[PDB]
């Protein structure tokens, strides 16, 4: 998104793109990103075109990898009523798939100690992002 250019210095769709194109971006996240940009993002055209190209390539590869992972997860979910039925019963199939996928197999998951399971699928705990809930539940995930 950052690279894109064209109308990006004022506002493309700049703050529009984040919410839509990078689907994950929540308002809080976006605000902090904006703040960072205002302070530390140098916004001088990329060190070299070569560098830019490389970054693009990386993005393409990374994205592909992510997609593959997602597909795998989906497959696991589809299967898991056969794979890890008890777990599914306890929780729900999608959740089970997510857990199991993260682990590796079912065996891997089993090997994982219970206290850790909690914080699987947690969004990387940022210092700046607020945490305390009315719940008192530190993990989420």
């Amino acid at each position: 998104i950052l690279e894109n250019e064209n109308y990006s210095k004022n506002e493309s769709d700049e703050l529009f793109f984040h919410l839509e194109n990078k689907a994950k971006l929540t308002r809080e996240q976006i605000l902090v990103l904006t703040m960072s940009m205002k302070t530390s993002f140098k916004n001088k055209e990329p060190l070299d075109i070569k560098t830019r190209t490389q970054i693009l390539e990386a993005n393409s590869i990374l994205e592909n990898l992510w997609k593959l992972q997602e597909d795998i997860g989906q497959y696991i979910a589809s299967k898991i009523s056969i794979i890890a039925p008890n777990v599914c019963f306890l929780v729900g199939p999608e959740i089970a798939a997510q857990l199991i996928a993260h682990a590796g197999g079912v065996l891997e998951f089993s090997r994982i100690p219970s206290c850790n399971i909690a914080s699987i699928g947690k969004n990387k705990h940022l210092s700046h992002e607020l945490h305390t809930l009315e719940s008192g539940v530190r993990q989420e995930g």
């Binding site: 809080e28 605000l31 902090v32 703040m35 960072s36 302070t39 210092s127 700046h128 992002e129 607020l130 945490h131 305390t132």
Partner: protein, 120 residues
């Protein structure tokens, strides 16, 4: 943090009784930042209350300033002085923490800012 509400009859609220252990830490931070800020001139001359002026003194100073501008009381040419006062309403009560945190990260070490945010 517990909030015993106050008893200023005309309008109540609020008193936040923070944990005694944390309080020390908070206190130190308050002392340090304020010291540091004063050293480094974070806050402009215009912000009050200063350490120098007792509020009546401050008022007096303000009055003097108002008097002691160039040709302020002249209204021959159709001049108009205007002394806008206002309460910045709900200022403390709608400080967004993310934004606040970011702002702090300009003026303090980020860890400190983070801590502050957490405490709030």
């Amino acid at each position: 943090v517990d909030i015993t509400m106050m008893e200023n009859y005309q309008n109540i609220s609020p008193v936040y009784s923070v944990d005694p252990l944390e309080k020390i830490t908070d206190a130190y931070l308050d002392q340090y930042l304020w010291y540091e800020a004063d050293q480094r001139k974070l806050f402009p001359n215009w912000i009050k209350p200063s350490d120098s002026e007792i509020p009546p003194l401050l008022v007096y100073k303000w009055t003097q300033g108002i008097n002691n501008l160039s040709e302020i009381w002249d209204v021959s040419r159709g001049q108009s002085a205007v002394l806008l006062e206002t309460t910045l309403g709900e200022m403390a009560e709608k400080i967004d923490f993310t934004l606040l945190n970011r702002l702090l990260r300009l003026i303090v070490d980020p860890n400190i800012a983070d801590y502050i945010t957490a405490k709030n």
